[PDB]
Symmetry: D2
Subunit: 232 residues, 4 copies
């Protein structure tokens, strides 16, 4: 479509307009639980889950004057183990994208390696994996075809509290930016200059991905709005 | 989703965010050709085709204060034979809706009979089939679970010209209305009091359906915008 | 404009995009206090106030296929005296509309009499004034050029609680409807068949009006969104 | 307001939701003629005119997570004299902004000098005034408190043809970008990194400005849509 927008104030079990992958599901709390949480509410380890809006989105078209999208979502991350892991992220990929093999834990279910098939995402990393590029502290990062963020900023994750994140991009400015914050707190912003049409196909699907590894945490999306438009 | 909107200014072959049924396809003209048109541009008889937005839409929710939707679309109908047939329509049905068996010609591919599984549609009827309720003239009608329109008005179809139609409804007014017109012409309006949640499931898919029978015509959708919202 | 939409999640003192009339102002609570409330927070009697969006709105145009608008707002009404009065309302009038002389108390600041200059409003009446048509109980009503509601329904006002109201209309259905409710409560709906272009000018201004008389209550608008569109 | 959007597909004489300054008016062609055009349709010299949306817009708020706006408009510039002058522009300024004294011709009615009261605009310059910074060719530029563009690109203006321009900005990316083009042509883009809240007040009014000097041209806005939102 030339333009598309949708808003989820909450979710229900089986949410018909979402494609669920891995362990992703909707809990009795009406939250999108990307990763596994048991009956007692304890997040499980070695979990991976993703959810995508059912309809493919036309993110770019050569004949268009400008293309843009923006998405805002709220999420809660509560540690299970004394220390949280691994993270959640908003991502954009080909319509037929699926959880890559071996993408667990530190790969956030986005990539099958720690090195037409492009992957762009904004990660909210709760566990520093320094041997693969992670700064030694929690952070938010912009990943383009690699778990190794092209840009990242220290992020003061708050256990259990609801965070609000806003992601934006248009083909004129060619800059992907994300701003995230908690109530009564200082926001964190991350930006990266990139022309998405050079790393992503014309058609994509958008959503979230998350994982736990040895360490755990809930990765719940509470609300989500998305908008994309192609102007000609 | 609590709200969803999309806009198609035109279409392309294989339009990824549309579900094609029957003969429906997109032509080199970038129009959604619901029914079959040959290489020379001649509409074929005995054709049936429908197209639905890929994502299911939450049209109602008990907890909502009000639910509404509106859609505007442009379409062109050019006769193949000296007299046009059969018609096209905007419709709403269950997500897994499929072309009913024996729904050709006068049934507009919407119903399998000329008498959870509800069907609501606004038909743009170009061929009067009087033995099944059609007034003896072209008309626009609102159908609820039956090809026999609950409400209809004379429609002065214009061969080949681009028509504009607007359909609206909200659960407060409980009135489905459609207004359609051609440039430099007098619009036609049709309304019917109905509470959609009593004839349609919570989740549906929306789109178009069209057919030709013994007589033919093109049934092309040129542009289409749709919006639905659930307020709580 | 052919279409216009605005959203107020809250308000500030002097709200630059609002026209204040009478006692209307914004409190430290960030709420639009239509009627006077003293330093201690006690609503004052004999008060009248209205607030309008600064920009005139084109509600109708002869060349348009269809015209529609919808507005949603939250409001709180807390009695000052043992019994509340008088009410608040959403209204539409000419751009240069002003508080009519003698419109206090039971006239809700909308009309100068209890009998191009049209006035359409949805009143939330907290004090039954039976000698002028009010049913003997609190209600919501649709007024067209008269304080005597053309349509009304019993309304179970709840002291202090935040109510949510949704008002809608389009020129195809020609039915003005309002649905209002409190959390964990049963909504109330009021509808009236009317073709607004026959009682209102093409251009108008929209907003709220409220009053207290012998008896008092706060008349606070907490949030407000409005949308209007003319399709051609 | 926290968010506001409006769309003008065309204009009428006296357009009630616009503030007209200088020579700005609406012609029989339904176009916003920023500068003077006589009865015969000949653009007049030494003209200056501006038009602003009547309602003030809240472009920034300290408590907001992110602030953004985007506007798209079509315009036609037909030379009167053998060579066109001077230009038109989209601009943002304080709500009470007025045509500065001595802002004619090369100053595009935006500044009173060729060197809380900030002025940000995107100029479409049809006449190179090299002694004041203009590159020696037609161009589009981003001006911040000065007629001397902070960023500019060569612009292949086409006499009489309808151009389409899209301007965007959000407080996360902190980059103001404009893309403009004619049908069947190569677009031109101009971007400048700037944090608008450091050069503009919280509240502003938005619109267009244009002028002719010794040389002339029409400066007609044919359509205009604007959107701004503050997310918290
Ligand atoms: O969920 C955390 C982490 O768990 C697993 O990695 C463990 C160990 O192998 C690593 O060397 C250290 C690095 O500090 O972290 C854990 O102790 C993996 O599942 C990994 O993907 C994940 O990030
Ligand atoms: O496409 C027109 C029409 O064609 C076929 O019906 C024909 C005949 O059987 C009917 O009695 C008359 C009624 O006037 O119409 C045609 O001549 C069928 O395919 C029918 O569904 C369709 O409407
Ligand atoms: O604010 C309530 C009411 O107060 C005043 O009217 C009083 C009296 O004159 C009326 O007869 C009775 C009717 O029950 O109500 C009050 O006691 C007026 O200001 C009136 O406009 C207002 O509704
Ligand atoms: O509208 C064009 C231009 O006209 C006037 O300037 C003239 C002259 O004074 C300048 O030196 C040359 C520079 O090439 O241009 C004109 O001939 C002024 O009104 C000026 O503001 C304007 O741009
Ligand atoms: Ca990590
Ligand atoms: Ca028929
Ligand atoms: Ca009363
Ligand atoms: Ca110049
Ligand atoms: Mn990381
Ligand atoms: Mn029929
Ligand atoms: Mn009353
Ligand atoms: Mn210049």
């Amino acid at each position: 479509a030339n333009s598309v927008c949708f808003t989820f104030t909450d979710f229900e079990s089986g949410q018909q307009d979402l494609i669920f992958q891995g362990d992703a599901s909707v809990g009795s709390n009406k939250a999108l639980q990307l990763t596994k949480v048991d009956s007692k509410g304890n997040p499980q380890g070695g979990s991976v889950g993703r959810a995508l809006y059912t309809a493919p989105i036309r993110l770019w078209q050569s004949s268009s004057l400008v293309a843009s999208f923006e998405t805002t979502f709220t999420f809660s991350i509560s540690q299970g183990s004394s220390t949280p892991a691994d993270a959640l992220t908003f991502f954009i990929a080909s319509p037929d994208t699926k959880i890559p093999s071996g993408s667990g834990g530190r790969l956030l279910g986005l990539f099958g390696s720690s090195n037409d098939n492009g992957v762009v995402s904004v990660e909210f990393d709760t566990y520093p994996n320094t041997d693969i590029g992670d700064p030694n502290y929690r952070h938010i990062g912009i990943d383009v075809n690699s778990i190794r963020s092209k840009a990242a900023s220290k992020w003061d994750w708050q256990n259990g509290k609801t965070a609000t994140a806003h992601i934006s991009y248009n083909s004129a400015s060619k800059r992907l930016s994300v701003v995230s914050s908690y109530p009564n707190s200082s926001p964190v912003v991350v930006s990266f200059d990139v022309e998405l049409n050079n790393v992503x196909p014309x058609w994509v699907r958008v959503g979230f991905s998350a994982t736990t590894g040895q360490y755990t945490q809930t990765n719940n999306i509470l609300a989500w709005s998305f908008r994309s438009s192609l102007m000609g």
